[PDB]
Design a protein around this ligand. Sequence first.
Ligand code: ADP
Ligand code: ADP
Ligand code: ADP
Ligand code: ADP
Lengths: 439, 441, 119, 459, 449
Amino acid sequence: GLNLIAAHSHIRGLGVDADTLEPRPSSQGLVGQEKARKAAAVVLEMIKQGKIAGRAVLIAGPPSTGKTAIAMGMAQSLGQDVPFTTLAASEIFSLEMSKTEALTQAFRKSIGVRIKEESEIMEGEVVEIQIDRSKQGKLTIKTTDMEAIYDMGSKMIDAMTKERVMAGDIISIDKSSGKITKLGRSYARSRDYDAMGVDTKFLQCPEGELQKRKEVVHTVSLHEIDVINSRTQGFLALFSGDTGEIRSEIRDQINTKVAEWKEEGKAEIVPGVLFIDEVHMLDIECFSYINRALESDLAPIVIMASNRGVSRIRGTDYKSPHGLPLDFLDRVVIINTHPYTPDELRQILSIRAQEEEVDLTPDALALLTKIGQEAGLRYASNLITTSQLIAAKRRAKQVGVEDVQRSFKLFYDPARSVRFVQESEKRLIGNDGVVDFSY
Amino acid sequence: LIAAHSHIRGLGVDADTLEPRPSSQGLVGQEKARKAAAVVLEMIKQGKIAGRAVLIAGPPSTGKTAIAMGMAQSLGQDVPFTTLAASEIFSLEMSKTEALTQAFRKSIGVRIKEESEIMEGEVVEIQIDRSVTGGAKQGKLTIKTTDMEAIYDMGSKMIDAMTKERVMAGDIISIDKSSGKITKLGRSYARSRDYDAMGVDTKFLQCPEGELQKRKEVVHTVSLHEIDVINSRTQGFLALFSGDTGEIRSEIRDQINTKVAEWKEEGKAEIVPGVLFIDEVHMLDIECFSYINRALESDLAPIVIMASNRGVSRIRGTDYKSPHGLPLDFLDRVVIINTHPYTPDELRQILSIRAQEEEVDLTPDALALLTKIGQEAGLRYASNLITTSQLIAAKRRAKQVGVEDVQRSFKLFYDPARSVRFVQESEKRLIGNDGVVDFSY
Amino acid sequence: EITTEGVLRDLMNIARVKYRELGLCRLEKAARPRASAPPIEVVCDSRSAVIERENIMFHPAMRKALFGPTPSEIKEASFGPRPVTLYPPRALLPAPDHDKQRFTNITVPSMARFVTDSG
Amino acid sequence: ISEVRGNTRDHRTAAHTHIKGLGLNSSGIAEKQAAGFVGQCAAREACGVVVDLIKAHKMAGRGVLLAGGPGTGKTALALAISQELGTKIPFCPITGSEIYSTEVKKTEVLMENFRRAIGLRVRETKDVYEGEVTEMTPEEAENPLGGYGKTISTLLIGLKSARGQKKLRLDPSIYEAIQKERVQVGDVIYIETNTGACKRVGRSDAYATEFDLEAEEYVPIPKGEVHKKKEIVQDVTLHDLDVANARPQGGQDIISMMGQLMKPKMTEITDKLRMEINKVVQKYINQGVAELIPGVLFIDEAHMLDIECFTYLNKALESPIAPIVVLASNRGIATIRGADDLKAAHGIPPDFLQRLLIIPTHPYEPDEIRRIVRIRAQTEGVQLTDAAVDRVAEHGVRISLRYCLQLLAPASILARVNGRTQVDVQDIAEAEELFLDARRSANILTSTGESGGLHGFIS
Amino acid sequence: HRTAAHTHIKGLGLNSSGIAEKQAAGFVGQCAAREACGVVVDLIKAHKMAGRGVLLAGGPGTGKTALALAISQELGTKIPFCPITGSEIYSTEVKKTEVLMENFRRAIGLRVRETKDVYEGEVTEMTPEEAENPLGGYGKTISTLLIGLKSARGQKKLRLDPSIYEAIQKERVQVGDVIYIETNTGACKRVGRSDAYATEFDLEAEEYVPIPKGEVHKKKEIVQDVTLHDLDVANARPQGGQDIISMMGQLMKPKMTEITDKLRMEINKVVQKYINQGVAELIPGVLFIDEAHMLDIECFTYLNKALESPIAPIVVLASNRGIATIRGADDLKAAHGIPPDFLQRLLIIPTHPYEPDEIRRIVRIRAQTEGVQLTDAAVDRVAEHGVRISLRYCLQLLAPASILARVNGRTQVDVQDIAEAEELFLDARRSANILTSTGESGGLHGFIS
Ligand SMILES: Nc1ncnc2c1ncn2[C@@H]1O[C@H](COP(=O)(O)OP(=O)(O)O)[C@@H](O)[C@H]1O
Ligand SMILES: Nc1ncnc2c1ncn2[C@@H]1O[C@H](COP(=O)(O)OP(=O)(O)O)[C@@H](O)[C@H]1O
Ligand SMILES: Nc1ncnc2c1ncn2[C@@H]1O[C@H](COP(=O)(O)OP(=O)(O)O)[C@@H](O)[C@H]1O
Ligand SMILES: Nc1ncnc2c1ncn2[C@@H]1O[C@H](COP(=O)(O)OP(=O)(O)O)[C@@H](O)[C@H]1O
């Protein structure tokens, strides 16, 4: 379907013995990184309990050391019970709104409000309508399994008229609203017409009883309730964006009402995770906002990842570790990931080869593991799919050594590419724009 | 509430000789600056001179705002006195130039004279006809004095106003026929008892007397900016208050300048030039100054009063430093008034005036110590300790602020100089200009 | 809206009360556009283009919303045995901010000018 | 309809949840450990006078600076001020970062928050009749008009609430509202005496079974008296009055209605409006029907403000109707954000710094850190051995207060997954090794990032 | 009545031979520059050339702005004089090159004769007729209005188009009103109630007006002055029709837009047809860009295109700067603060600093213009400050000294009143010395640097 094979598709959870949080060496797709996975498992326990507000956790380490893999594993093993907002730091730099506004939204996306609801709804195919224009009338309506005649009040006849309901329409009535919806026409009426209007849709007739009643659980983020209240039909902005800088007295009133819904047991609050990937792209003005935002009773737990050494903080000109202000790091606990040993690389390459459904020969996996050690995990991972496509051109059933070797000579790793750049200094455009096109 | 300049209630000068009194109207000292400001008040009040830029210069405190606020208090209500923080000119709704043009034109008043007719009488009858399911309305009002009674036709706008106001028989009402405003003033007799929900009981009044109609001259003062906004639009005059004006086109302002001159010669309007006070003007940039150079040259320019704390300082948007932070071809157009730091006998008087304005009863020893603190730490800091000492004295239920309360205030709250020492003494635990800090003990 | 002394009601109405008190609704216009034009049109020698000009540039449903119900609709709504709703419930064009100039740039001479424009 | 959750309704905990007040005697002297505070006794006593300044309502636009290193309790003191004042007093906290709107100039954003921090309390009487309509009944007039088919002198309405029944003898003009609102018998309505009209809330759910289908919601009968006359207290900020005037909400026309359907951008409101609001507000205060409630604007990371913000605050603070402004800063000697060649103490311009009452917050002694650890533990509900309290306090001294406090929740989890309800040294020693501090992480960057070609940090 | 910096300038003060009189029309001196500005005036009145540039180059206070104002007075009120500073080009609504084009087109005038074809009368009867639209969904519509208009001379009944009835609905017309209907636009104006209904007994202040004289149907001839910019803007954001776009255009917030060269070339063809029809004449004028050093390299590059336009105005630039960095081109320095490239296009009129006797003569002109009487000792004392400090400074003293004199009851300013004005009101350089002398001190009483 739409879910093609991506780089993290093999990560199916955090891979820890849940009663004790001890990481199993290789499970649920995660290999190695046990110290970081145990720290991530303790963070999940804080998240799942929900009692702790606004801890910040930084996952730090070199490129290709599982910082994204571990955060994806937490998303997979936290499950859809809890909000998990994933934000690239580049997304905060909106034209529609302030940086701090964009962060206020991402924080509130990560707090759920959960409500449990009984809705009573009638859905059926219209058989006929009768009206006594002496106002009153009768609706006859069917499922596949049941049929009934209902007495209509005058306003129902007005609404049925304005919404142009006719026989063979599937309609629903929400009993709580008292509002109709034409869902479509039954497939049985497909023969009524030689030409159809653009807006018409055919449906199967409703099935079972007419007046269904259902227990439904609804989970809605605080950000959704902001956008709904921002303007008269604000629920449209949930999709188009287009919120503007929602005025704070709206958010304060929403926070107060949600606190009443909890106090009255009408709702429960479900605190979740904001994951800010590559957080070093935020600037000094962002971090100063996040300092205060973490210090709030409705703050999510925030997780973030960085691969920067000592590096310049954006929006200023001094350097700091991870690229982050020390004032901010004073609020953060840090999880460090590490490079992989050859036996961990061998496993990750096997997990990836299974997910990409590639049959590596044992010698191909051996060579590919050496490449991953010499040239990096992502490069060797990219050669798996490449070697499969080259083997298919041989009509070969398994990826052989020669298919990995040909993949290796055709596609340069970063180090070999940097060498090629250095040996081509005068033919490539330098940082001063000079180049020579001559032979 | 009491604020920083609430004691300033004038400029404190003899209206005849313009001689500054050493203390008067809440102002102390600064006599040369106060005399120069008194001369500028005459230029404003006479109005004949357009676009003289005056800069009040001096170190922080020394009353540059206090003198400008004294002038505002001396001009009174009719004259415009626009105050800008120079930082207000930077805008996303409009260019800096447009923001300056609006502030200049806010500082010119146009005093329109209108003649209006008001009705006033007892309502004897009211009749309203309403269409079913439609907007059509008509009606008649029978209204009375001790000397007249007449029946007036009503339009839809009157009928809306009459019902919004709940006009009922026996009410005394007045109607401005020009604006269409209706107001009730009372009743000729009790509210009738048969109906429920008839609302709160009014004032009593005897019936009005004489003729129902009378003519009344009414005077309105509006800015040239308010006229700009009204005339750049068919609709949306809410922009007068919301900002939201956009960048008004210059051919509109050309027309308004012509028509206002025509209104003046026609005797419809009196033009009333006021002042633009720009506060801490060194926040303007080189493009602003280049605009102001020539904005001053209109015969509709206000007098522009300016303040700066700056020494030789960098001009904004510019590589280079200049006196007051202002460029030289701008300063060529500007006369400068200089304010000076205070004598201890002046500080004692200012602190006494602040204490009186804040209703605080200082002991003479507390005033002496506050004066000494004023010399060493500054006038603003010593004025903050007055309010602080009052609170501390009240918590110990003392009748008066003693030296005890001033000393405790001085202990609790650091002055700027002592705060700078505290910062120097803790450079490792405070965050540096290069972001390093140590959190460990 | 509902309290018997309208303190918070009046506080929320200051801007428009002030505007009318200044007489800016009644003061003569000191400027107008020096030129005025209708919209540009496509010229295409097809009947469909002419139909489309009427459908968009003189759009019936928008015009009907702005100017409201017709006189027979007011009769048919008022004399019926049961109530009936109207496509717009009212004319949705706003009231003009200027009481005398309204939605046009036409101006009319007056006796004030006539007395004063001869010395 | 909605299924109520019955089991539990306990609080979350955040960085300052233990702070309950300033912890001061009736003499205003600080108690050495009270209301969740440890130490800062001088800064708490100064903030105590600030609370009394605010609560006295005498003064406008005084400035306060909380100055001190990171972690020295400055935001704890601000939150304590807000709690000493209580929710009747407005408290508007922002960071200096929050001022850089994309919709309006940053001085408008600052002035909005400035007037959010000023409250107004208005007392009025509300006076309405309410109920389901039990009956509607005309009275013919004794002098009917010529040429008219009927003349009605009164229109009786029966109103029923949950607490009574009343016959309202109304003025006949209410026919207009009844027709336009389409009031039936059994509809819930109110009649307001300041207009004499009525409005329809809905149909009473006593009639929810009239039909198998009708297209309306049903509403409960009013559970008040049938006649509700009472005083009502309305709290609005002066910013609420700005927006209510600059963006009127109730407009019936197409342009108003398109307006409220589009993105409601804020606008650079004029000083002319705010001044006219101030002058009418002051009329009602002098009449005594409203009372002003000056609150606190708290600007966290005030060193994020630039020199244009500070030069505007000069003007703002001089206005007669202004909050108390509290600033907090930790930036030592630093460059002013908008003036790249001016360095000053606190990062505050010296021109502006002269206005402020300055309160310094100092570092903590080891025994104060240990006391805070125990207060924080009993607030997060963690139970510790005394050896674990000491080991945590050792990290508080050697590394940072914040770091040691943050280990308590990880250690609590690590304890219970060994079946222990009480956290002990073994758990602290694992939390501190799973969860690094800033400095130990920076040592790894220095050691492993010694080169960058592969397996090294990006630098 | 109100007196500004240039109120004494009345013209260039030239002989019919084009030679400057040494003191005339408010000027003293600048004779070579006044003669060059005279030739510029005659270049403009000839209305034959497009897109010539002039630079007024010279130090601050040397009368460059006086000269540009004198050109505007020599040209008189028929010719467009469009004055701007370079700081005005930096719009937030539209690109900087748009406001250059708007100001170029404000500088080009047109005088045009217009026929208003019009109906007038008292409304005697008014009757709508209706369309029974079956399936539009908006319900019915009105198909025409029949309206009876009566004047003093005659009467008509008009069957109006729906869009003209919508104009009457917007104007709130009723029977017995007097109305005006411009058939050019289809606009309707309500003139008032008919005087036949003149009565006190209406609560609203109605305009009671007499029945229109003459025929109900008229044609009026009007001569209009417009610029090309007025035509551009009218056709960019249309508001003249009774169509829905024009209608809603009157309700939306006014907004400048980056008007295309397609619209401008189309309006050239429109104007060319008014000229060929003989109803219009072109009046090309001038754009004065004061402070032209505040432009930038993109503006100057755009003028290289704009001045090639075959109906560009004459452009007069003032600059006051020596060798200076071009804005937006921070590596490039040139004379006048103008790019060398664009400077080749200009004729440069240099202006020169005044002699002591010229300054003394300006002081007398300016004193007479502000209406203040000085002793000759006073005039000499002020003239000394003009020599030693600045002309602008010494002229700023006249108004303070007059007040200070009047405050002592003397009607004539003498040296004591200037001696007080000198001490109350400092110049830039005495103030810069106070700054420099105090700035050795730090602490509380220092100036902030
Ligand atoms: N411990 C692991 N187990 C399984 N796959 C991993 C592991 N670490 C990294 N990968 C995979 O290798 C690639 C790079 O790791 P990733 O976490 O995305 O890099 P980074 O550490 O830079 O975020 C991804 O495809 C990821 O799924
Ligand atoms: N000469 C004076 N007389 C009375 N009050 C003064 C005087 N000078 C300063 N003040 C008061 O002291 C404070 C500081 O002066 P201010 O006018 O703010 O200085 P600045 O020139 O920096 O604006 C203000 O509250 C002002 O009212
Ligand atoms: N005196 C104190 N008593 C109790 N807890 C404190 C005290 N000072 C600081 N804390 C706590 O330690 C942390 C650091 O204080 P904080 O106010 O955030 O410092 P700052 O605002 O100066 O950065 C916060 O979690 C705060 O609740
Ligand atoms: N030749 C002159 N005769 C009379 N007044 C002059 C003359 N030159 C300049 N002035 C006046 O002196 C002042 C400075 O001249 P201005 O044109 O502003 O200089 P700039 O070249 O800087 O524009 C103005 O008030 C102007 O009216």
